[PDB]
Amino acid sequence: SASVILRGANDFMCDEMERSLHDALCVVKRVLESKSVVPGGGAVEAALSIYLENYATSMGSREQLAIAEFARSLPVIPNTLAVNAAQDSTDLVAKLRAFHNEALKWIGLDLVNGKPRDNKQAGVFEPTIVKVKSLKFATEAAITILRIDDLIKLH
């Protein structure tokens, strides 16, 4: 347990600083949970994008386009990050790919600055377990909705 005494000239200050004290309270944790980790910013998704893009070309059959699209539904993460960070998605997104296959994996999007930066060197690391669950859940989420041909909710 603990007891972080948070002061504040105004309750309105103690409320946002308490919500901020919880932000880096869960970041410092994910960084030490599990040895396996990955450089955020979009690097990860970027890698899988190109790699899976090649995987589709090696599989063939309907699974070629099925995997291709998948590799196109991954770079959406860094694409949005740039959009919500006041950066031109298309630019960074594309620039990320080139800088993702030149300076290796450790190349993601640093919304703070707004340019493909070495998240590994920067310190941006997230427990791989998060990535796994993210994909797993999201994936299973689709299969189900695609498995729906008709329903019956009724008032």
Binding site: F12, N84, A85, A86
Partner: protein, 359 residues
């Protein structure tokens, strides 16, 4: 498809900045006129034949049934500001509205919020340092305190006997001053007679015994006295005071603008936008006088940048005069919090890009 419960409106992106900003801007222009000694008290008539005549922005926002959340947050801005000191309730509202009015413009030029807000939050920090870099430090001291408390009783129903109320507030605050506590001054209002038959009752906590011919008049003598005590509570925490009449706003403005060209970049515009926004105070001010706002603004910044900051808008003369010479001073705290409460609100308000309601 019904992604979310039927009839649940959901503004997104640009559709949010519009409906949110304007709504707040509009509500800020409503009580706007109720600014200055030339205030235009509206006669609020609730949907039942009611008749609410008032000048205070808060009291007005608490009578006008609002439906849009954006305008509701405003009524909350006047709720916090009005509780702290009291007056200036319209100030914080007008500013918060303008900031959004000047922001939306930049949105037209397609200036992504991230950049804007960033400049807003930082600009907010500038005003604070500015306010302190030009405040006039005045003395406790019974004499001074009186003047401060007096200026806080010269606009209400208690102004009739402000002098008396002042000595009462001065004593009640100077006695319960250990940081002074605003919970050690008991107010015992008793209907009957004139507010002139009052007397502070003494003590780690006195018992001020007010008097009021009526029931509404007696409660008013309690509130104004409490506010008269507040300013005194500020001279104990914020012994600083800056010239009113807009003199302040103009300074911070001329300063911020200058800083804009020093910072350059995309945020070079917002800086000015905030400075130009502070100009509304002296603008709307002179407006309540029927004088030329524009013309005044010109001559204002004119003699202002040339001869110190001691110049301000003289509503009684419809011209620019040395506030300091006229003896027009406003507690730095008054202004200090204003800019703060304002910018802050506007900031997070600009972060709102969607609101899940029901209809």
């Amino acid at each position: 498809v019904l992604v979310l419960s039927q009839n649940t409106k959901r503004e997104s992106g640009r559709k949010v900045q519009s409906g949110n900003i304007n709504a707040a801007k509009t509500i800020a222009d409503i009580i706007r006129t109720c600014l200055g000694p030339k205030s235009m008290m509206k006669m609020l008539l609730d949907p039942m034949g009611g008749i609410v005549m008032t000048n205070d922005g808060n009291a007005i926002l608490r009578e006008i049934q609002v439906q849009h959340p954006a305008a509701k947050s405003m009524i909350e801005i006047s709720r916090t500001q009005d509780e702290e000191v009291g007056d200036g309730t319209t100030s914080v509202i007008i500013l918060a509205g303008e900031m959004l009015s000047v922001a939306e413009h930049f949105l037209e030029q397609q200036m992504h919020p991230t950049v804007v807000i960033s400049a807003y939050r930082k600009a907010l920090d500038d005003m604070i340092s500015t306010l302190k870099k030009i405040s006039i430090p005045v003395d406790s001291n019974r004499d001074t305190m009186l003047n401060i408390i007096n200026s806080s009783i010269t606009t209400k129903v208690i102004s009739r006997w402000s002098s008396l109320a002042c000595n009462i507030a001065l004593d009640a605050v100077k006695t319960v001053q250990f940081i002074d506590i605003k919970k050690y001054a008991r107010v015992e209002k008793i209907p009957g007679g004139i507010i002139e038959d009052s007397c502070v009752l003494r003590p780690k906590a006195c018992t001020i015994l007010l008097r009021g011919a009526s029931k509404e008049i007696l409660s008013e003598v309690e509130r104004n006295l409490q506010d008269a005590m507040q300013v005194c509570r500020n001279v104990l925490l914020d012994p600083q005071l800056v010239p009113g009449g807009g003199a302040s706003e103009m300074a911070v403005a001329h300063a911020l603008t200058e800083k804009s060209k020093a910072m350059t970049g995309v945020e070079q515009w917002p800086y000015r936008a905030v400075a130009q926004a502070l100009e509304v105070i002296p603008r709307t001010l002179i407006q309540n006088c029927g004088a030329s706002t524009i013309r005044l603004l010109t001559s204002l910044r004119a003699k202002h940048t040339q001869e110190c900051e001691t110049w301000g808008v003289n509503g009684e003369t419809g011209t620019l005069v040395d506030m300091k010479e006229l003896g027009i001073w406003e507690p730095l705290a008054v202004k200090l919090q204003t800019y703060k409460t304002a910018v802050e609100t506007a900031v997070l308000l600009l972060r709102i890009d969607d609101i899940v309601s029901g209809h």
